Design a protein around this ligand. Structure first.
Ligand SMILES: *C1=NO[C@@H](c2ccc(NC(C)=O)cc2)C1
Ligand SMILES: *C1=NO[C@@H](c2ccc(NC(C)=O)cc2)C1
Lengths: 131, 131
């Protein structure tokens, strides 16, 4: 009677395309302007719904009961553009890479945007460096 | 040197929230108006980027090199609202359920929007009913 089916890696497939659309700057509805001290400013286009799905801070930031028209620019301060890139990548790919020296700055970014899995990851790594 | 990390079920987690946002009608940028013969019209709000990630037909339908302002209404004909609901659900949940009698109508919808995994699923099921 009730025929049901589930594609295992659909979400991984869909995020692949959603990442392709980001790199192609198609359907993006938010531009993240990152300005950090002495580093040059950098823009990052993305989809609010995707960022919200990976960061409770973005979710609350975009869920204001309003269908904002067209593009919305968000001014981000206190984080290095390099770091914001890795976090966006993680949101669209569920993965993140970096050098040992920037792990701490990524942890700060993960905390600032409450991306727990990244926080816990950098936490356990830093503890392993000890001794 | 190069510290990398990957959260396995991130995409499943993110789609959970993206589905929550749909049911809450937050960040949606497309309304699918479905009108089918004698059945009453039905609306379905969703996120273009999500639909595009699961349907090449939606991807081409929304990727026209334009950041359309606010909400866009799409007139859909030739498919029953019940069927469009299941397909949207699959896009946001990677799963789909239905009764034996409507499996064929879902296959028609999956084909119409080139959601291969659903097409192949209903295909193999119908072949199993035989004999
Ligand atoms: C990895 N995390 O931050 C990057 C970085 C870039 C440039 C500097 N230079 C000064 C003066 O701050 C430090 C750290 C590297
Ligand atoms: C499952 N697929 O389509 C649904 C349905 C609803 C209403 C009717 N009635 C007429 C006259 O077409 C048939 C099929 C059921």
């Amino acid at each position: 009677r009730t025929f049901s089916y589930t594609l295992e890696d659909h979400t991984k497939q869909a995020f692949g395309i959603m990442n392709e659309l980001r790199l192609s700057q198609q359907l993006c509805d938010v531009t993240l302007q990152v300005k950090y001290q002495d580093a040059p400013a950098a823009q990052f286009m993305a989809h609010k719904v995707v960022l919200a799905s990976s960061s409770p801070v973005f979710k609350a930031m975009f869920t204001n009961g309003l269908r904002e028209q067209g593009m919305e620019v968000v001014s981000i301060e206190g984080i290095h553009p390099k770091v914001m890139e890795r976090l966006i990548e993680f949101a669209y790919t569920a993965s993140i890479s970096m050098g040992e020296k920037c792990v701490l700055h990524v942890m700060n970014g993960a905390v600032m945007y409450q991306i727990d899995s990244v926080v816990r990851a950098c936490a356990d790594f830093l503890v392993q460096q000890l001794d």
